[PDB]
Paper text:
Cardioviruses present a highly unusual variation to conventional viral PRF in which the virally encoded 2A protein is required as an essential trans-activator. Here we show that 2A adopts an RNA-binding fold, allowing specific recognition and stabilisation of the PRF stimulatory element in the viral RNA and direct binding to host ribosomes.
We crystallised the protein and determined the structure by multiple-wavelength anomalous dispersion (MAD) analysis of a selenomethionyl derivative. The asymmetric unit (ASU) of the P6222 cell contains four copies of 2A related by non-crystallographic symmetry (NCS), and the structure was refined to 2.6 Å resolution. 2A adopts a compact, globular fold of the form β3αβ3αβ. The most striking feature is a curved, seven-stranded anti-parallel beta sheet. The concave face of the beta sheet is supported by tight packing against the two alpha helices: together, this comprises the hydrophobic core of the fold. In contrast, the solvent-exposed convex face and surrounding loops are enriched with arginine, lysine and histidine residues, conferring a strong positive electrostatic surface potential at physiological pH. In addition to the N- and C- termini, the β2-loop-β3 region (residues 28–37) exists in multiple conformations that deviate by up to 5.8 Å in the position of the Cα backbone.
Residue numbers in the entry: 10 to 141
The structure:
Amino acid sequence: TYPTLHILLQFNHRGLEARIFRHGQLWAETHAEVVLRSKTKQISFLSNGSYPSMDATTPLNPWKSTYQAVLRAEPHRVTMDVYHKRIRPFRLPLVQKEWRTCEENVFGLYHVFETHYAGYFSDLLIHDVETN
């Protein structure tokens, strides 16, 4: 097996929304209080796992900025590649991260993601899945 998670990330004026997919099924959701309008600050947060100063929530000047994180648990490493909008063949990842660790399952693979963004995401709301 290879555990894989696809995480759709939306930055908006309300914060950062993570939707976690598993074989194309929405498996889990979480939210973070990460309010960042510019692409530069968003990608800096995505790379570093944190950002020092958040922007103001402005419901009259809203925004929507979307990224996709792809996590793979290869036999002797975990990788995370983050793509603008979604993984496509014409575009390359904005952020590349790698860890010398073995993960058994999607729950461990999510823990790696959550630990890179430590302190930000609330606990998972999880949904019924019908695998394959």
